Design a protein around this nucleic acid. Structure first.
Ligand SMILES: [Mg+2]
Ligand SMILES: [Mg+2]
Ligand SMILES: [Mg+2]
Ligand SMILES: [Mg+2]
Ligand SMILES: [Zn+2]
Ligand SMILES: [Zn+2]
Lengths: 226, 61, 1333, 99
DNA sequence: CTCTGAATCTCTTCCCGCGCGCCGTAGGAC
DNA sequence: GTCCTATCGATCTTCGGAAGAGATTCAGAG
RNA sequence: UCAUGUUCACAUACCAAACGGCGCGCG
């Protein structure tokens, strides 16, 4: 499910952060600095992206549970859409500390969410007092927002595709602790050391984020088709 | 409903219909998903066969 | 442990010690007051493991904290008592000992490897003689058993510059002496040292064996035991029974024998007994271990009761009470139950009722899974009690558990897939299983108290398989033939017949109605009779060329009941299917056409409605039976009183000697036949005659409402052959040896039989019952042999890519066509592009499925022969391609990749196996086959060929009759003439073989003398004679070598030639011959110079597939060209074939008493028939090929089923043939690494060839060779599946010296180890596993 | 007669047979060919292991059914391990193999 | 003088289920 | 009466299976 | 704007029926 260079350039992936906010661990994955702003080397980007995509495709083909971590409010909608498009699991709002490492507790949380949702829709209980309904609804909304994507995930994921490692660093650490492969998009400010499949690129721009999501979605879907 | 031939019109190998009906019924019973067809409290056995009738299942899903 | 193959080999002594956890020493088991196991006996807890659940025997430790400590009070290990069944021990034998299996298999593996006769190694091993080894500077050989006299000789004729030993040590030494590879390298050269077939082959065996011992890791001494492993004790438990007594647990008596003997032998060895004493105990020990391994291959089986032989280990493995058949291949299962079935008429076809008591005792795990889910019970501990109390809630729970969980019902035996089916249960108050009426026919479930078992499927996958595949709604067709199995139940068809008749007088007859609904109001109010004639408006529907309905409407002229019945038909069929008095055939096609036009989902409901309807009108019909309704034609009295005197005419001639003792009988029984046909015909006329009624004025006749005649004429039950006996006459009867009774049963069961007629009647019936009870074994052993050869097949490619195949025609024989092309060819795929009759116009593309609209199209054409792919020709390795198999009969579309076709075929042959028994016509024109012929001086065409056949073609352009015509018959119509039906086409001598001349001229008895070659007969009838030519059995070489001859002669010295012929008209006389044409007779073209005067039911298929050669194998010619005699008959005759070119000197020993179809001068081919009698497939394969043997076997087996009315699609026989000829025999090894001649699986050589051909090196060539299934299974390439069939101790040792390895491809092996079969759903998984690769 | 669960034989753990004992019906040899003749593989796998012989799997199955999980773990039947030892109790080294 | 024919011996196979019923180491020595 | 040790190492295992096939035993001779 | 506070004393701690003939019977 490869992506073209012209398309990447058009999207605006090559653009990075200011030169002062850069990580010298990202100094290999940098081409130049135009107008005091780093430019990511797309020549090195595309093969890395392709390699990551291939690994993801293989995992999907063997029925791997990909988890799409994206919390930036600009990219939250897009990541959620991509995940559901390729029938996968996602976390579009704040990553709860120890979502994976403290799985037995977040498991209890998911059970609670499922029960509340079931009561809301299938229950048809009617006896709500208005107060009880309001409290139940608030709980349901909060749970859905936080854990709505992983509610059907059942267990832990077999791979973690992550938008911006510096922003979603806690997730990266959790994955590392467990030993789940990470496929992170890594801008010039981010540190790539925890990431297993670094894909240099612009985490900030929305079009770029969409492009990354869409390509990943295509590859997972392809794996599912097999 | 019981005769699965209209689902076999959709999964043109009949063996794949058992592998797909099982996989989908497991996403419901075990994976915790719920059906895109209106359920009538049928068994997942029948729900998954009724999910082929909506024309929205193949082993990509 | 996970695994993916199985390997077998001989166990070296150090391996056997490795399996041990201890060495057994004492001949004991458990104490006889207390019941602790006696230490170092066969149960010692420290050898094998602790008895108590997780706690030790000495009592010192009783808690998991100590898990794995070993005590020092008695020495036991504290561990899982489960492992007490896992761990072995061993016995150290005081001497080596031969393993009985390798001593007495098919050959002996010991003896064969040694080149030493079995009796002679046994003569060592039971201590009867010495055997000599390392013979050195003495006059003695390398093995050469020598009697104790002959050793006592050598002990002083020689010193000890040699050795000889006795008993198993001596054999062990001999095996150890094997310089094994060097012996092989020699023997594989000594192979060439003669061309002597009578050892080249048993030497091929020996040179195979040596290389198998080389290529495995094996070593020959391991045939001899030294440590004997003992079975883990839990597998041979010494259970107590009724009071303080142990069950006699056989093996523990056998090991007890061994260990006692070994205790003695260690004693007497160390106390240094003399040779005669130790040869005693050593014999008794070898003769005891013989018991422990395979008791009763000894001279006599040993016993511990009233001569009951003790069951030894090898008696536990093999056969009908041993693991492979008794516990592995099929086994008892939980969640099951059984009951008497009873009919439930109200069921929809998918349901069956089963008793609430059973559902509640079967579904218990699911019921607990609701009571916890209601939270109504705390857990198992409460829900168990809440079910036991049978509280008022539990049924509303049960009726939620079951609410759509399919349950599997099968009778036993269960011949074919339709014999297990799934149904949705509905609850019942009683205790019987309420089955659906239409489905009882499939099971051959009668309702006379015939029990049936039920099984619950537990998992989700088992429910999805049950609903998708096995549910009764999905199985309306037979697997075996395109014919429904929902075929209506006799009462249903009785009701529909009664509903649809027309009665010419009736209430309300002749009015005109606006539709079925007011037809029904008219019936139900009693205003019109149901079979009254009427006109109605009707509407009917048709689905157009696109498939969309056109609805139409008209007046129809019909009956009230055909109007009512039309209301049940689904809206897409034409009314012309209902507008007729319906009966069992007519309604089966009705139902079939519903399936043809609508499809399944309407058909099952339409079938249900038919059932309900037929029952309801059959009720109203009151269709009773009553003795006043048995109708005797009073002409019967005259017909006997006439025929009796004509029999007495045959008797009065006999009373005057004026007719022979044979003729009197065989004519009398034909007079009784002429009476019997007349009685039957008068009775069927009387039954139709009994109904006549006033058409408002004057009487008129109509089809008889006579009770028994409705039942016959409808096809409900009891057609002509029964009603004939009820009221016509019972007729001729047969004696025990089948020969016919001289005076028949002229009575019938409406009237009485007297005592003799009854007593003779039982010779029929008791024969027919003996046949049933005797046959039901052989039929089952047939189906077993078949599935257990077919089970290796699975459809595994879409299209193998062949363009090869075989040709289908109507079977034209005995005159008319016994089956049309539309039976054979429907639903195979074309092999090659099928042309328009004529030329160059193609009609069907070259790999198109000939479904029904294509086969109707072929029937629109004058096609006679069609070439189609057949599984015997499909070049898929390890399987079959789908297109080559063609239509799946139970679905009508092409087969699904992965379907288990082999098992379907074997069952499809076996299902009717109980129905067997174990005891010119029309105008056309002459066509001919092989018939080289000449014209006589009258100008008549006289046949000069001997594989001669006749074909007749009808003028609209298709062949429709065929005949086989002798040599020297005259074609009364020749030269392409057209002829009328029954216009005699040919004439021939019925009694003798004729011999005739091509030339005309004078003749002599050339090279002949009276008394030397011919006998000067008088012929007593005339005194003027035809001479007898002498038989080679009546006269010497001075008559034999003087072979009598009749050359046609002229003073030119040669005859007027045929252009391009050198041959004179020399002709010859065989034995027995009659000759009227002596010397100096002028012979015409066409003159006869001389004349020469001259099966079963089921076994004739069982012995067909096993390919047994018949008693009377027709001698078939070979290669080509022309015959000659070899040397004449003494001991036997020898005769020759000599080609047009190449190897002239082919000669064959030939039997004298099978008269020969050729003499000396006859042009011949590989496959021309030199005698009569039946053929033998081994040779057909050699001479006309694989396609010709398929065509032979399919014909000669279907000629059994067609005779007994059974139907089977032909493909299910080819699938057995496909397996019969899976093996091949190497003629050229070429460049391949097979032995210089070898037998191999054909796929293995073919796959080597294809790549070697791509390498361009010389591929191997072979003949395929046809094994019968009882052998072609044991030759499977994979020991588990063969060994679990039969001859277990063969297969399981032959495979063991080879060290063979099994990859577990195929079905039966995966069933044994209990994993998904690689078929069906499990094929699709094995395929995905193999694709992601 | 009907049986959910109850006795098992000692030598090999298959169910007892009878009414006089609370037995399970024999899914005998011919029935197995009948399943093989449908595509039905999972039914067969169950019928001759989980429902029958696999000493682990049947207790895991039972609990999955009371839990209503409708899933099986199929293992390998203990009667077949009986066979291996009864051959290996001859000097015939039969063994399971890996690749 | 033993080589391909044939001749006598043993081994191996014989439906599937099912239900009852009973019956179940001995002899000798201390 | 109980415990321990052994079998027809001084007879007689059933004729009423057929078959069907193989291993193993013998003809008429080059 | 607000100085001082005698001495010594702190506990818990490694369990639910088994295997073979002989029969009769059902299908
Ligand atoms: Mg019956
Ligand atoms: Mg002070
Ligand atoms: Mg102080
Ligand atoms: Mg102090
Ligand atoms: Zn202990
Ligand atoms: Zn093919």
């Amino acid at each position: 499910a490869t992506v073209s260079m012209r398309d990447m350039l058009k999207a605006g992936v090559h653009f990075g952060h200011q030169t002062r906010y850069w990580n010298p661990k990202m100094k290999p994955f940098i081409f130049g600095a135009r107008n005091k702003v780093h430019i990511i080397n797309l020549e090195k980007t595309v093969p890395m992206f392709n390699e990551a995509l291939a690994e993801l495709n293989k995992i999907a083909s063997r029925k791997g549970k990909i988890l799409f971590v994206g919390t930036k409010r600009a990219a939250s909608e897009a990541v959620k859409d991509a995940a559901l498009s390729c029938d996968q699991f996602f976390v579009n709002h704040r990553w709860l500390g120890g979502m994976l490492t403290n799985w037995k507790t977040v498991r209890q949380s998911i059970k609670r969410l499922k029960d509340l949702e079931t009561q809301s829709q299938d229950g048809t209980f009617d006896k709500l007092t208005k107060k009880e309904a309001l409290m139940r609804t608030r709980e349901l909304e909060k749970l859905e927002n936080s854990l709505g994507g992983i509610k059907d995930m059942g267990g832990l994921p077999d791979a973690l595709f992550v938008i911006d490692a510096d922003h979603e660093h806690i997730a990266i650490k959790e994955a590392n602790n467990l030993g789940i492969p990470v496929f992170a998009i890594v801008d010039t400010n981010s540190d790539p050391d925890g990431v297993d499949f670094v894909i240099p690129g612009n985490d900030d721009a929305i079009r770029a984020v969409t492009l990354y999501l869409g390509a990943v979605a295509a590859t997972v879907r392809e794996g599912r088709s097999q | 409903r019981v005769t699965v031939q209209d689902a076999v019109e959709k999964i043109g190998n009949r063996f794949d219909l058992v592998l797909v009906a099982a996989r989908r019924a497991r996403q419901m019973q075990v994976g915790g998903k719920d059906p895109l067809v209106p359920e009538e409290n049928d068994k997942t056995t029948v729900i998954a066969l009724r999910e082929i009738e909506e024309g929205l299942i193949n082993n990509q899903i | 442990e996970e695994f993916d193959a199985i390997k077998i080999a001989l166990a070296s002594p150090d391996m056997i010690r490795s399996w041990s956890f201890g060495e057994v020493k004492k001949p004991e088991t458990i104490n006889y007051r207390t019941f602790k196991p006696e230490r170092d006996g066969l149960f010692c807890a420290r050898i094998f493991g602790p008895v108590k659940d997780y706690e030790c025997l000495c009592g010192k430790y009783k808690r998991l904290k100590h898990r794995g400590v070993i005590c020092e009070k008695c020495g036991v290990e504290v561990t899982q008592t489960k492992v007490r069944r896992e761990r072995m021990g061993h016995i150290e034998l005081a001497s080596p000992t031969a393993h009985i299996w390798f001593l007495k298999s098919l050959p002996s593996r010991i003896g064969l490897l040694l080149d030493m006769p079995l009796r002679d190694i046994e003569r060592v091993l039971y201590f009867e003689s010495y055997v000599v080894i390392e013979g050195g500077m003495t006059n003695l050989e390398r093995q050469q058993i020598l009697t104790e006299e002959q050793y006592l000789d050598a002990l002083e004729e020689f010193g000890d510059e040699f050795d000889a030993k006795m008993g198993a040590e001596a054999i062990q030494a001999l095996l150890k002496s094997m310089d094994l590879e060097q012996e092989c390298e020699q023997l594989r050269e000594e192979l060439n040292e003669t061309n002597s077939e009578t050892k080249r082959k048993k030497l091929t065996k020996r040179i195979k064996l040596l290389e198998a011992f080389v290529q495995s890791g094996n070593k020959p001494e391991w045939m001899i035991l030294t440590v004997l492993p003992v079975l883990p004790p839990d597998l041979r438990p010494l259970v107590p029974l009724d009071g303080g007594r142990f069950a006699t647990s056989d093996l523990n008596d056998l090991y007890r024998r061994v260990i006692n003997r070994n205790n003695r032998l260690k004693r007497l060895l160390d106390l240094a007994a003399p040779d005669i004493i130790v040869r005693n105990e050593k014999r008794m020990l070898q003769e005891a271990v013989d018991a422990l391994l395979d008791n009763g291959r000894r001279g006599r089986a040993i016993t511990g009761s009233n001569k009951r032989p003790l069951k030894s280990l090898a008696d536990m493995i093999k056969g009908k009470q041993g693991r492979f058949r008794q516990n592995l291949l099929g086994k008892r299962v939980d969640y099951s139950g059984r009951s008497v079935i009873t009919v439930g008429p109200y069921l929809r076809l998918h349901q069956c009722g089963l008793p609430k008591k059973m559902a509640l005792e079967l579904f218990k795990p699911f019921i607990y899974g609701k009571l916890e889910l209601r939270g109504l019970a705390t857990t198992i501990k409460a829900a168990k009690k809440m079910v036991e109390r049978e509280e008022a809630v539990v049924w509303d729970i049960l009726d939620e558990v079951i609410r759509e969980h399919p349950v599997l019902l099968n009778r036993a035996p269960t011949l074919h897939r339709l014999g297990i089916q799934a149904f949705e249960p509905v609850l019942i108050e009683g205790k019987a299983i309420q089955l659906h009426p239409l489905v009882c026919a499939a099971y051959n479930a009668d309702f006379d108290g015939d029990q049936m078992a039920v099984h619950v499927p537990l998992t989700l996958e088992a429910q999805l398989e049950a609903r998708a595949l096995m549910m009764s709604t999905n199985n309306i067709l037979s697997p075996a033939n395109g014919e429904p199995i929902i075929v209506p139940s006799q009462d249903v068809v009785l009701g529909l017949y009664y509903m649809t008749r027309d009665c010419v007088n009736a209430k309300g007859e002749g009015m005109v109605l606006t539709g079925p609904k007011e037809a029904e109001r008219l019936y139900r109010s009693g205003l019109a009779s149901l079979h009254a004639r009427v006109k109605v408006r009707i509407t009917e529907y048709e689905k157009d060329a696109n498939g969309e309905l056109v609805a139409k409407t008209s007046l129809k002229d019909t009956t009230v009941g055909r109007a009512i019945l039309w209301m049940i038909v689904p809206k897409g069929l034409p009314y012309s299917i209902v507008n007729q008095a319906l009966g069992k055939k007519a309604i089966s096609k009705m139902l079939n056409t519903c399936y043809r036009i609508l499809g399944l989902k309407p058909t099952v409901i339409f079938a249900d409605q038919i059932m309900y309807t037929g029952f309801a009108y059959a009720a109203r019909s009151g269709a009773s039976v009553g003795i006043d309704d048995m109708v005797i034609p009073e002409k019967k009295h005259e017909i006997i009183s006439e025929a009796e005197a004509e029999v007495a005419e045959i008797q009065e001639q006999f009373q005057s000697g004026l007719v022979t003792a044979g003729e009197r009988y065989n004519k009398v029984i034909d007079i009784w036949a002429a009476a019997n046909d007349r009685v039957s015909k008068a009775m069927m006329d009387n039954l139709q005659t009994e109904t006549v009624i006033n058409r408002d004025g004057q009487e008129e006749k109509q089809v008889s409402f006579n009770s028994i005649y409705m039942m016959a004429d409808s096809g409900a039950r009891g057609s002509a052959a029964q009603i004939r006996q009820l009221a016509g006459m019972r007729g001729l009867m047969a004696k025990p040896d089948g020969s016919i009774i001289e005076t028949p049963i002229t009575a019938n069961f409406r009237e009485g039989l007297n005592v003799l007629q009854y007593f003779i009647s039982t010779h029929g019936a008791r024969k027919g019952l003996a046949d049933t009870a005797l046959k039901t074994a052989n039929s089952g052993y047939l189906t077993r042999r078949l599935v257990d050869v077919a089970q290796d097949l699975v459809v595994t490619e879409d299209d193998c890519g062949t363009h090869e195949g075989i040709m289908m025609t109507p079977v034209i024989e005995g005159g008319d066509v016994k089956e049309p092309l539309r039976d054979r060819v429907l639903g195979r795929v074309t092999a090659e592009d099928v042309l328009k009759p004529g030329t160059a116009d193609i009609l069907v593309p070259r790999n198109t499925l000939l479904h029904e609209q294509w086969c109707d199209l072929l029937e629109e054409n004058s096609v006679d022969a069609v070439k189609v792919r057949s599984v015997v020709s499909c070049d898929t390795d390890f399987g079959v391609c789908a297109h080559c198999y063609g239509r799946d009969l139970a679905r009508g579309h092409i087969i699904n990749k992965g379907e288990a076709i082999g098992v379907i075929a074997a069952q499809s042959i076996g299902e009717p196996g109980t129905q067997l028994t174990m005891r010119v016509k029309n105008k056309g024109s002459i066509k001919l086959s092989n018939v080289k012929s000449v014209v006589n001086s009258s100008g008549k065409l006289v046949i000069t060929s001997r594989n001669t056949e006749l074909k007749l073609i009808d003028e609209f352009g298709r062949t429709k009759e065929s005949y086989k015509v002798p040599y020297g018959a005259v074609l009364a119509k020749g030269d392409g003439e057209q002829v009328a039906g029954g216009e005699t086409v040919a004439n021939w001598d019925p009694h003798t073989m004729p011999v005739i001349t091509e030339v005309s001229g004078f003749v002599r008895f050339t090279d002949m003398i009276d008394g030397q070659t011919i006998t000067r007969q008088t012929d007593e009838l005339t005194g003027l004679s035809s001479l007898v030519v002498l038989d080679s059995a009546e006269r010497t070489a001075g008559g034999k070598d003087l072979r009598p001859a009749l050359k046609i002669v002229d003073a030119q010295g040669n005859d007027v030639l045929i252009p391009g012929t050198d041959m004179p008209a020399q002709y010859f006389l065989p034995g027995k011959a009659i000759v009227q044409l002596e010397d100096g007779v002028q012979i015409s073209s066409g003159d006869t110079l001389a004349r020469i005067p001259q099966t079963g039911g089921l076994p004739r298929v069982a012995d067909l597939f096993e390919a047994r050669r018949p008693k009377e194998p027709a001698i078939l010619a070979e290669i080509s060209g022309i015959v000659s005699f070899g040397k004449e008959t003494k001991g036997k005759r020898r005769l020759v074939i000599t080609p047009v070119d190449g190897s002239d000197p082919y000669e064959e020993m030939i039997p004298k008493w099978r008269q020969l179809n050729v003499f000396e001068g006859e042009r011949v081919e590989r496959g021309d028939v030199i005698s009569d009698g039946p053929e033998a497939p081994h040779d057909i394969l050699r001479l006309r090929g694989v396609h010709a043997v398929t065509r032979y076997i399919v014909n000669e087996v279907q000629d059994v089923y067609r005779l007994q009315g059974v139907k089977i699609n032909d493909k299910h026989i080819e699938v057995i043939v496909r397996q019969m000829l899976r093996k091949a025999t190497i003629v050229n090894a070429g460049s391949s690494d097979f032995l210089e001649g070898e037998q191999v699986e054909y796929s293995r050589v073919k796959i080597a060839n294809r790549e070697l051909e791509a390498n361009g090196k010389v591929g191997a060539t072979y003949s395929r060779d046809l094994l019968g299934i009882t052998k072609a299974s044991l030759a499977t390439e994979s020991f588990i599946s063969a060994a679990s069939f039969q001859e277990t101790t063969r297969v399981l040792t032959e495979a063991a010296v080879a060290g063979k390895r099994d990859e577990l491809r195929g079905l039966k092996e995966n069933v044994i180890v209990g994993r998904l079969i690689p078929a069906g759903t499990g094929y699709a998984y094995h395929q995905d596993r193999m694709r992601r690769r | 007669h009907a049986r959910s669960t109850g006795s098992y034989s000692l030598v090999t753990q298959q169910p007892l047979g009878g009414k006089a004992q609370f037995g399970g019906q024999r899914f005998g040899e011919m029935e197995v060919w009948a399943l093989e003749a449908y595509g039905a593989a999972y039914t067969l796998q169950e019928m001759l292991t989980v429902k029958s012989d696999d000493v682990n799997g049947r207790t895991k199955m039972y609990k999955n059914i009371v839990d209503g999980n409708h899933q099986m773990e199929p293992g390998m039947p203990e009667s077949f391990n009986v066979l291996l030892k009864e051959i290996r109790s001859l000097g015939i080294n039969i063994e399971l193999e890996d690749e």
